[PDB]
Design a protein around this ligand. Structure first.
Ligand SMILES: Cc1ncc(C[n+]2csc(CCOP(=O)(O)OP(=O)(O)O)c2C)c(N)n1
Ligand SMILES: Cc1ncc(C[n+]2csc(CCOP(=O)(O)OP(=O)(O)O)c2C)c(N)n1
Ligand SMILES: [Ca+2]
Ligand SMILES: [Ca+2]
Lengths: 807, 415
């Protein structure tokens, strides 16, 4: 549960002191100096003579354009924090402005506190400049390596979804969220503005959007800087914001005036925020118009206005570096020298190379500092969830009537379970879902909380299970749902979201970035404590999108997640819920886990339950398992074939194939896979099955029929170095399907029980069985023709029950 | 190419100092004295025992009516150039206001630096008063013999075309273009207004039109003075100007109160021009509304109200000389004596007859001075053109096919 830090939502009531503003100007000037330094200088940080091109980096890596803008804002936010004692986390949309984030951390004292090698003296200042975007050094973005960051801003557009996740169930948290005007052109950013109808000003914190309207992205102007100011204002008002606009640096107005104007404006907005928060103590059912700030300043603010006759300040040319080289010529190095001198470092640094005390006297102390605030390292806040007994959700009926029982909808059991997680962990757990929580069958959670909704109510006949405050949130944007949950985890809370499988792909790129964040964190950032896993229920999956058709039939998220399964990072979970009981086992493991993206593939369709809780726990701990009770073979030598399934439906088709093989008197072994990564080469993954364990399950010499939920390519590439790999005959989804019957879905993809049975015969003795094979292919066409003619499936397919079930 | 002189388009960000305004009143008073001096006195500049008809020019040559208005404006502009370090050239549209122009050059020091016979003292002062519109002296208009003049305003109409032509490719140059209200009735001037469509606030400099709405030309009211103020303002806004208006001298308002209001308005107009110029560094495709100043003052301002029962201040009757002779009678000579004493020259000149240090202290220095600005002497800026090799363009086919060949358009070769 988020901590109450500082003295939240306090008005100042006095003007901002001239003293504190002189601080901010110094912060600004020194942060700009540190920022140019990190880009340009390998040595001689303070320009002690002789200062020459030998001091300048060979390759210029880093972004200036965004950075002076960031430095001004952060300077002013640091003043704000100190004077008000406000719990504040910043979201740096333009994450390519990493020099501003490292500067902030250097100057607030979290950098030295975290990297003691980087000292508050000339020598520390020198390693500090060299390390930036430099071999064996630090990233060029506001990376997880930087104290203060929960958002890299590498991949643009998640600034607002991250900002609004952070404040959820975080009533003391202020989040000034800085958004690139280029970033604002992305789809994820454009929908993120609407988050203000999904948060409550009493129970959640406050996000102040700051649009960094610097006029440009890389090689273009931005749309929002070149529409009318009037359009820009209606735009933000229409999305439920009170827009304030600040314009500085397009004229000769001196720095002190700029700082005085800004500080008055900032305090006027803050006053408005303190009134929103004070009102919300009495009235949290009326949605307020939340302030947002349009920060219009020239890109590259304070760089040379022109370089080699090209406009540089207030241009896209300042995007990366305004001065392409400071080595090629003396005239160029001279521009660097002048530029660095214009911040007057002689005033900012004492002879020992430390920043003077009067630069940083206005700065916050302790856990209020941007870099030290525990919300920016949410691991330190994160508690274990109080979990209910998994026993109470177990489908007991498998133990009663045998493996293969029933027509249960597995995701309902995950719903009962998550419901009680929310009940027992209020303010600490959230379900997100893109208008799919009921569709994926997770609505049992509506018994103990509601869908959070802070737009209009109209009627009890339609507005069911909705309140201004609640642990479930739903918007039709996978981006928003991935986004909110990511930031809710980064600030030390927990959750699950669900998606139709096909549409997980919408946020493939966001899985990549959070995976990279997690990969970087577990390799080389041990100060950044572990966060709860991004748990993702993948359901309404390909084999039962027979009702929605081809658009909804893509299980390929499996393939994407496999490209983040390296270096024994163990940040990817890929689980196949065989049934309700396997789903509970996976669920508990995932909800206990940390530093992972967990993807749980589970059906919502009525389906058999195969395992007891115990059998599922067992299969899950190793990842795969022989099903002895299902196997006509007694050991691997007797076995003529290995029937292996991954996914609840493949399991179903394999078990049914197994009953037809059973009647022809074939000896076969049945294998279930629940953990895809258990099959990964034991060379690449220390948690996979050993080649010995693998060979014991898949036999080493017998052919294996593998029925796989997703695309067969996934397995053929996982097991390339595995014992017996060349005897694996892998069936998976094959881009066949439409709106049809469950049976046609498996049939047309050659993973139906009939084809599986036939395939198993072909692989034992083709000629010996030529006629039972030919009988099976004929029936395959007859059952299809039965569906075409009757509009439901042949009763052979429909009415089948595993032989192992008794009345 | 044009030199960047001084510190262009700087806001003061401070109220105009009282000392400077006292300077401007002293400029205004001395310049009015030096102006009436140039017109009326052959000898005895500073009126010492005996000052009589003996010391007065026989033929009265010069224009007074426009002059005190110009002296007011130029005093205020001089205060402006010093305070701001602004590269400034004026266009004296009412060229007949020549005394305002010479007076200016005498006081900014460029007259003595250029014509060193005309010293800064009683002897110089006597010479200077005598030579005005005098045989073997200088002209009655703001002629090229006058430092600071790129524009004579003898043939009225070219005040705005000259002002806008001067600012092209001259981004640092500011041009107060003082247009007469009679002049503003001429074709050339009427379309000269529209030149704010053919200049760019980033690559060209800035023209400030000052309409000298002093109510009259020679023998008539001016159109622009006798239309409703609401019309006058719409006219100017239609032509892409923000019109500001200043009215003074119609009531008893003490002169220092007028200087304070005028200076406050001038710097408001200047803040806006500075805003236009700052914006252009960023957006120079959207045409702004350029300030213009409507300066409404009585014609002949500070001359005697009435003379021989006829209204003279606030009248056409003052266009040339309000007092038609200071010799014909002794009553007339006492009018010129009282008129010259009204500026209190006993406060403006020291013993030698030099203008006092406190009168000129506010004034600008060096190349910023109206009379010493290189733009006012284009020649000192002019370089030879880097011409291309003339062979490259020659119609060569005449040598090969002989004399009289072809059907060429000759201008294209000049093109
Ligand atoms: C999703 C995505 N697409 C493309 C890019 C490439 N990119 C990185 S920076 C940038 C421009 C950013 O412009 P803006 O947000 O306006 O930033 P600033 O001006 O503050 O530097 C682009 C196109 C990206 N980082 N992320
Ligand atoms: C084209 C042209 N026509 C006529 C004249 C003669 N003239 C000189 S001064 C004058 C009146 C000018 O009035 P205005 O411009 O109002 O000047 P001010 O009132 O300042 O004396 C006239 C008609 C002239 N100089 N140029
Ligand atoms: Ca931008
Ligand atoms: Ca007139």
């Amino acid at each position: 549960t988020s901590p109450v830090i500082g003295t939240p939502w306090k008005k100042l009531n006095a003007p901002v002191s001239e003293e504190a503003l002189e601080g901010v100007d110094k912060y600004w000037r020194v942060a700009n100096y540190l920022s140019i330094g990190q880009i340009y200088l390998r040595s001689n940080p303070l320009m002690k003579e002789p200062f020459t091109r030998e001091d300048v980096k060979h390759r210029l890596v880093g972004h200036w354009g965004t950075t002076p803008g960031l430095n001004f804002l952060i300077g002013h936010i640091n003043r704000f924090i100190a004077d008000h004692g406000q719990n504040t986390v910043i979201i740096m949309g333009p994450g390519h402005g990493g020099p501003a984030g490292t500067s902030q951390s250097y100057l607030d004292g979290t950098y030295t506190e975290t990297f003691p090698k980087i000292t508050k003296d000339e020598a520390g200042l020198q390693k500090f400049f060299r390390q930036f975007s430099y071999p064996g050094g630090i990233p060029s973005h506001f990376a997880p390596e930087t104290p203060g960051s929960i958002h890299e801003g590498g991949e643009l557009g998640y600034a607002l979804s991250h900002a609004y996740g952070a404040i959820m169930d975080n009533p003391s948290l202020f989040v000034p969220a800085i958004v690139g005007d280029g970033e604002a052109e992305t789809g994820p950013l454009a929908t993120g503005w609407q988050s203000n109808k999904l948060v409550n000003p009493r129970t959640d914190g406050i996000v102040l959007p700051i649009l960094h309207l610097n006029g440009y992205k890389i090689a273009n102007p931005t749309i929002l800087s070149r529409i009318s100011d009037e359009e820009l204002h209606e735009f933000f008002h229409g999305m439920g914001y009170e827009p304030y606009e600040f314009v500085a640096g397009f004229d000769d107005e001196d720095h002190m005036s700029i700082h005085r104007r800004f500080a008055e404006l900032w305090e006027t907005i803050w006053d408005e925020i303190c009134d929103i928060k004070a009102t919300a103590q009495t009235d949290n059912v009326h949605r307020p118009f939340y302030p947002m700030l349009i920060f219009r300043t020239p890109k590259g603010w304070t760089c040379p206005k022109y370089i080699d006759g090209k406009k540089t300040e207030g241009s896209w040319r300042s995007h990366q570096v305004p001065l392409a080289s400071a080595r090629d010529t003396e005239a160029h190095f001279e521009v660097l020298k002048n530029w660095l001198e214009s911040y007057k470092p002689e005033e900012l640094f004492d002879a020992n190379g430390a920043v003077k005390d009067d630069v940083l006297a206005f700065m916050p102390k302790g856990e209020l500092r941007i870099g030290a605030n525990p919300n920016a390292n949410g691991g330190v806040i994160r508690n274990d969830l109080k979990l209910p007994n998994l026993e109470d959700y177990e489908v007991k009926e498998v133990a009663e009537y045998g493996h293969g029982w029933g027509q249960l909808e597995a995701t309902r059991t995950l719903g009962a379970y998550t419901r009680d997680i929310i009940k027992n962990n209020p303010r600490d757990f959230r379900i997100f879902g893109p208008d799919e929580t009921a569709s994926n069958r997770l609505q049992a959670s509506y018994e103990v909380t509601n869908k959070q909704w802070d737009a209009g109510y109209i009627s009890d006949e339609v507005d069911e299970h909705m309140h201004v405050s609640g642990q479930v949130v739903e918007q039709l944007s996978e981006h928003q749902m991935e986004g909110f949950l990511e930031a809710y985890l980064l600030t030390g809370r927990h959750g699950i979201w669900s998606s139709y499988e096909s549409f997980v792909h919408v946020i493939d790129s966001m899985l990549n970035q959070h995976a990279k964040w997690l990969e970087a964190t577990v390799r080389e950032i041990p100060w950044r404590k572990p966060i709860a896993s991004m748990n993702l229920l993948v359901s309404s999956h390909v084999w039962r999108q027979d009702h929605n058709g081809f658009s909804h039939q893509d299980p390929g998220v499996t393939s994407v997640l496999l490209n983040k399964c390296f270096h024994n990072d163990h940040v990817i979970g890929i689980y196949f819920a065989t049934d309700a009981n396997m789903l509970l086992a996976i669920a508990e493991k995932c909800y206990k886990s940390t530093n992972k993206i967990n993807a749980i593939i589970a059906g919502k369709q009525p389906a058999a339950t195969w395992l007891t809780l115990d059998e599922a726990r067992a299969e899950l701990e190793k990842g795969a398992a022989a099903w002895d009770w299902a196997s006509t073979a007694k050991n691997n030598d007797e076995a003529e074939v290995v029937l292996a399934a991954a996914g609840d439906v493949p399991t179903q088709e394999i078990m049914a194939a197994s009953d037809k093989l059973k009647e022809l008197g074939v000896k076969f072994k049945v294998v279930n896979v629940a953990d895809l990564l258990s099959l990964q080469s034991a060379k690449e993954n220390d948690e996979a099955l050993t080649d010995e364990e693998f060979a014991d399950i898949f036999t080493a010499d017998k052919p294996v029929l593998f029925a796989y939920h997703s695309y067969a390519h996934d397995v053929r590439g996982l097991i390339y170095d595995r014992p017996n790999h060349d005897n694996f005959n892998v069936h998976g989804y094959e881009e066949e399907g439409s709106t049809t019957t469950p049976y046609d879905m498996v049939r047309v993809n050659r993973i139906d029980r009939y084809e599986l049975t036939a395939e198993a015969l072909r692989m034992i003795d083709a000629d010996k069985y030529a006629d039972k094979i030919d009988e099976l292919e004929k029936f395959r066409d007859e059952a299809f023709q039965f569906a075409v003619d009757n509009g439901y499936d042949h009763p052979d397919y429909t009415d089948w029950v595993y032989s192992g079930v008794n009345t």
